[PDB]
Structures are given as C-alpha cells and as structure tokens.
Design a protein around this ligand. Structure first.
Ligand SMILES: [Mg+2]
Ligand SMILES: [Mg+2]
Lengths: 414, 414
C-alpha cells in the first residue's frame, strides 16, 4: 500500500522445495531503526557491486523497501509497528534482508523480531561463526572457532506464554497447578509470575533434520545436540532424545561403540559425521577450552541465543556476526546487532553483520560467485587494517574508516 | 543411624542470625562419588593444617561423615540415595561440606544436589570467581576478572515442574492452556513436553538483598541484575524490577541521573555502589570483552548456572572453582565439578575446588585466619608451578603432582 513494487524485476518462485531465482529478482529489505540508516546503504552498495562483478552485468537485484518498527509508524501511522503487508510480502517474494529493529516499551508490544519469526514460521535461526584473520579477539586462539549454530526458533520459553504476578490469570494457572495437578514445588505461590516452556517432537525433529542435512551438504565433521536435559528432562531432555532418534531413523545412525554417540555416513563424501550431545553449561566452558571439537551445533531457542552471543564475542565478531531465519516458504536474513541510537546517522558503525548476512542471502539464492566475492572483500579490508572504529580501537597500525568507506574498502578488496 | 557422631566436638549454634562457633565444632562432610574419594582426604588434611597453623592448637574441627549418593546405597541399602537424616544433620549442625555426587538414570530420581538445595531451602548459590596468578587461561587478560555470582537457588525452571510429551498430565495442562487460558502460541500441541518457570517477589528480593548486603560488607563497586527480561517479561523482567525496587526501598537507592541505574551509598565506606542491569545474552559477551565493569552479579537459577560456568572457564578455573549454598538456617559448601569416574582412586585430579570451598566455609565460621592461610597456600603452589595434571598440561616449566601431593604443596606455601 505504501510499498512501491519495482517496475523492472521479477519474483523468486518456489518450485517444490527449490528456489527459482530470475536474473533480476525483487528482494524486499527492511532498513532498520537506529544505525540501520547507516549500515543498510553500505550493504546495498557492496551487494550491487559484488553481483556486478560476478555476472558481468547479466544479473541485477531490484531492491524493494518494506517497513517494520519505528520507520513503519512514520509511514503508516503511530499505531503500526508491524504492518500486515510486510508479512505477506516476505512470504510472497521469498527472501528478504533486514537491519536492526526497535520494539517500544509501555505499549504491551512483544519483540517485533520474534513476531516476524513466529508469524512466518521461520523455524531455523542459522548463525555461522568463524574467525576472520586479523579481527581483534579477547581469546588467545580464535582461529580454532568455526561453528554453525542451528537454533530452534518456533518454541521454548520464547513462545511468550506467560502471566503477571498477582494477575487474575496467574492466580488461576497457579490454582490449576496446585489443586488439579498437585504441584507442591512452587516455593512462593503468591506474587508469582509464571512462564510456560513447550518442546514438541515435530519442533525439534524439523530443526535437527536441517542441521544434519547441512552437515552432509557441507561435509562438516559433527553435529552436537546441546541441552540442559539433566534438569529439564521433558523438554530439553526430550530434544536430545528426539535428535538422536531422528539421526538413527532417518540418517542411518550407528552406535560409536557403547554409545551414546552416533555415526552418520555422508552419502556423498563417505566420511562419518559424529552425532553427539553435551550439557549446556559445560558446553559454555568447552567452546572456550576446546573449540576445535565442535562444528555444527543444534539447540533450542534460549540456549542458541546464549551460545550464539558468547561465540560471536570470542572471535571478536560481536559486530560482524551474520544471521538467517529460515522456514520452508521464506527466509529473512539480518543484522544480528542492535540499533545503537547514539551513533545513528554518524556513519561510524560496522556494516559487517548485515553485509555478511547479505552474502548468506546470496548463497541461498544460488548466487555463490557474488557471495564469495563479498567474503573475499571482507577478509581483504580487515587484513589491510582498513577498518571502522570498533576494530581500530583494539588494533595498532590500523586506518580508521567510516561505515560507508568500509563498504568501499570491501568492494576494493573484491 | 549409621553416622557416628564425634565424641569430642560441639555443635555450632545459631543465636539469632549470628553463628556461635565453638573451638571444637562438629562439621559434617559428604565425601562424594567418583573423584570425591581423592579430593575430600586432601581437603580434610589442608583444612586441619590451616587451623593448626592459625590458632596454634586452640581450635580443632571434629569431622563427621554423612551420606548421599552412591556411597549412601552402600551404607543404608540399594534404594536410598538421599537419607532423611542427612537433611536433619545438615540443618542441626549448621555448616557442611561436600564432594561431587552421582544421581542415577533409569529410576526417576531428580538431581540429588538440587534436592538438597530445595529441601533445605538453601536459596543463595554463591560462586566467587577470581584469577589466581599463574593458572593457565584461554583468554588474554584473565586477571581482569573478579566477580561474585549470587544465583537464586529455589525457583526458576529448576523447580522441576514438568510433564512428559503424550503423557496424560501433559495432555491435561495443554488442554487447560488452550481451552481455559486460550493460548494460541503452542506451535505443535501434540507430542509436546511442558515446563513451568515460576518467579516470585519473595524469591527474588531475598536473593537480591543478600547480594547488595554482600557488596556493602565487602565494599564491592556494583551489583548487576542479569536477566532476559525483554523476552520473559513476567519472570525475568519481574526479577529485574523487584531488584531495583528493593535497592530503592531498603537501601535508599537514587537515580544515577535519568536512570535506570541506581546508586546505593555504602553505610560504612561512604562509597557508591552502582545497581545496574544487563540482558543475559549481551552479558555473556560483556564478561569476555569488558570484565572489569562487573563485580557482584545477581541473577536467576539457570542464568547463574551458565554465567558461573562460563566465567570459571575464562580464568582457567573449571577445576578450582569454589561454591556455597546458603540458606537462613544452614549452609552447604561444595566441590563444583563432577565425579569424573575414569580418574577415581588414581590420586590425580585437582583438589582445588573443594579446598577453596573449605576456605569459604571457614570464612563463614568466622575463622578468617585459617581461611587466609589456605588462599596463601593456593597462590603459592600455583605460582611455584607445583601443580596437578590439568594445569601442568598447559604449562611449560611445571612440576607434575598427584592430588594428595598438591595438598601438601598448599600446606607448604602457607
Ligand atoms: Mg542473541
Ligand atoms: Mg553449573
């Protein structure tokens, strides 16, 4: 309604599982709030330059601005933070990319990003974290990290099923729990908020199936189910058991003698993928002390939220970390950082995260050459120490660049 | 009944909040399973040596072996993993110390440690993590870490209120949620496990009150409430708000202009303690990138479980990390690592964690001099590079010591 759908440009089609990408596809983008005003122009410019370089003018993207968050209230009216047509348009045009979003407090509006994820059933939150040589890191050996996080995105305590302390509703489910379910384990039943954590069989098998499949397709060495199953037996513990069960039943998993670990043979390279599990708090130590043991990681919503963030900080990538939200009908790639409003409009923040989510987008479209040119550009700029303020603070011998100038530096190292 | 209560030795008394410790107190200890057989003898010997040194023979501890876990089935019978008298004896004798415990799988027996914590209402899990100079660390600057974790121990998803997928009970609470509570947010209501996360006002105020009080008594610079309140508004978000509310109402907190942060003035040193909050996934990055900003940490059960573990791994202390479980009537100090059965009986693992939980025990008894002699001994042994295998693997120029020999090395550096 306020989106101006591009004159040239053609819709991507989903021809039974497979994406059918034209040479001039229309790609929706949500600019983002705060520093989205800085990083999204830098990403449109380097993506455009990378497909110009790779396909020598044969392919072109027709970018289409759609709206969510704060810019949405400025376009449609004060009350509309998530327009219904943004949801239809992501679904229709199949892939989209976004900058950081603001959700308001004081209005009873739950996280707009989690609303997108659940409303479009984008059940895979894919977070790849690897070290880019030369980025300043807090740990001694960040180069030992090359993991890919498959975080379940549609259930867990993130579903948002909760009630306020002293509210009538909370009173009522605490009454049901104590009287009809006989729970004697609530220490203080009065002035008590209640949260519901659900974990289903379809929810975890569709996420784990995607993780094992990614390991076969990219012949990764292992898939680690991380969970806190010793304490949460029927949600987290069920996740781990449904994950091992699916590796056995669908991928022909075999005991690595005695168990619990399984072996899956890659149907293409002939190698064996270890399917293993580790408890979540011990995993938080293991990624620091033994990061070379792990590769593809499958976990639930909250655990994936924490694992992702801790892992991005150890390779020095809190501001260059990419992210994808993938469902069966569409996908939404994104800047994984926040809006940082203090710096907005100053052209100073790292455009790295949304640019690396744009290469994930391209790679997903099958435009691998363009995707490869962007990570070449990225490795070059960082190695040339021609970098933005967040990196330059920690580097000795670096040249300080603006957000936009680092965009040009990526195009220059392509 | 099978505990032989010591002939010499007198019970510690609780004279209205205050502990009344005799010169010869009876202290219960649970040896532990696995490597408990190695580390608990090393701790009894260095504690004994430290109080012998500090009080020149005037004070003596009368150790009393009590039973839980696997050794309990060997003493009382196959069916008894947690004897009822262990609970009465910890409560009666007021302080106790324990090694690592095994909980069995296949019997429907929930974690024995969480049973101790909840059954005795030991609502504070106190975890201090600081760097001991010379321990091998994965990060560049571990010496910047000196934090004290106040983890709420009696509620959260750890309460153990959950139901199995496809069980009649799960069917029933999913029916109540959908029909009587009208929840439309469960993606897959079939084959769905359910967990209940409770968070009450009394539960978080009693934990936060203990954290702020510890900051005043040890004049620590700040108290950080960590939570994932943007997603879990009525449990995690309520925790943060009840924490700020208690700092205002009981400690005379004032806005550090504009807020949300508060200032508490230490009634003794005159300094100002910053009361702040940070979101839990961003905190996991912040402890790596800016560890000097944080000091005392107050958080809920699961978050404290993760924070504790990640923090112990960055200062190279996964095997020397101390821990206390403190309630109003008693306390239970502990080895925070597992049973490691492969190495049990070999005299090779680090006795560091249970020995440093024994100095926390002593310090809590008011036997500060003895406590101080143990951390002096610890700093000496580690600095002398006269160390056990887990440290020696990562050190160049170290002498390898057995579990028991490192005990003697601590006594020697006292
Ligand atoms: Mg996150
Ligand atoms: Mg732990």
């Amino acid at each position: 309604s306020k989106v101006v759908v591009p004159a040239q440009g053609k819709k991507i089609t989903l021809q039974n599982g497979k994406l059918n990408v034209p040479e001039n596809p229309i790609i929706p983008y949500i600019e983002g709030d705060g520093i989205g005003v800085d990083v999204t122009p830098a990403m449109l410019k380097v993506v455009d330059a990378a497909v110009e370089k790779a396909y020598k003018g044969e392919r072109k993207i027709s970018w289409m601005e759609i709206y969510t968050g704060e810019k949405s209230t400025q376009v449609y009216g004060q009350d509309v933070w998530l327009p219904a047509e943004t949801l239809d348009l992501i679904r229709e045009y199949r892939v989209a990319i976004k900058g950081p979003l603001t959700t308001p407090v004081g209005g009873g509006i739950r996280e707009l990003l989690v609303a997108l994820r659940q409303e479009l059933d984008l059940y895979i939150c894919l977070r790849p974290v690897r070290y880019y040589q030369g980025t300043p890191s807090p740990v001694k050996h960040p180069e030992l990290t090359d993991m890919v996080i498959f975080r379940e995105n549609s259930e867990d305590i993130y579903a948002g099923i909760e009630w306020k302390a002293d509210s009538a509703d909370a009173e009522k489910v605490i009454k049901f729990l104590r009287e009809e379910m006989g729970v004697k384990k609530i220490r203080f039943p009065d002035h008590c908020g209640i949260g519901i954590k659900p974990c289903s069989e379809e929810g975890t098998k569709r996420l784990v199936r995607a993780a094992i499949e990614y390991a076969i397709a990219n012949d990764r060495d292992s898939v680690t189910l991380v969970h806190k199953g010793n304490i949460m037996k029927f949600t987290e513990g069920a996740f781990k058991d449904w994950g091992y069960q699916l590796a056995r039943e669908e991928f022909g998993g075999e005991l690595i003698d005695g168990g619990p670990w399984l072996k899956v043979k890659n149907p293409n390279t002939g190698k064996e993928i270890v399917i293993k599990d580790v408890i979540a708090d011990a995993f938080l130590q293991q990624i620091l002390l033994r990061p070379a043991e792990y590769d593809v990681i499958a976990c639930m919503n909250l655990n994936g939220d924490y694992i992702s963030d801790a892992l991005a900080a150890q390779v020095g990538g809190i501001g260059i970390a990419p992210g994808a939200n993938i469902g069966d009908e569409c996908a939404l790639f994104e800047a994984t950082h926040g809006t940082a409003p203090k710096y907005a409009g100053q052209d100073k923040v790292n455009p790295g995260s949304i640019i690396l989510s744009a290469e994930m987008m391209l790679r997903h479209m099958g435009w691998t050459e363009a995707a490869d040119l962007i990570v070449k550009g990225m490795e070059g700029a960082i190695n040339a120490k021609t970098v933005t303020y967040d990196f330059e603070r920690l580097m000795d011998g670096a040249k300080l660049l603006k957000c936009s100038e680092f965009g040009d530096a990526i195009i220059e190292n392509m």
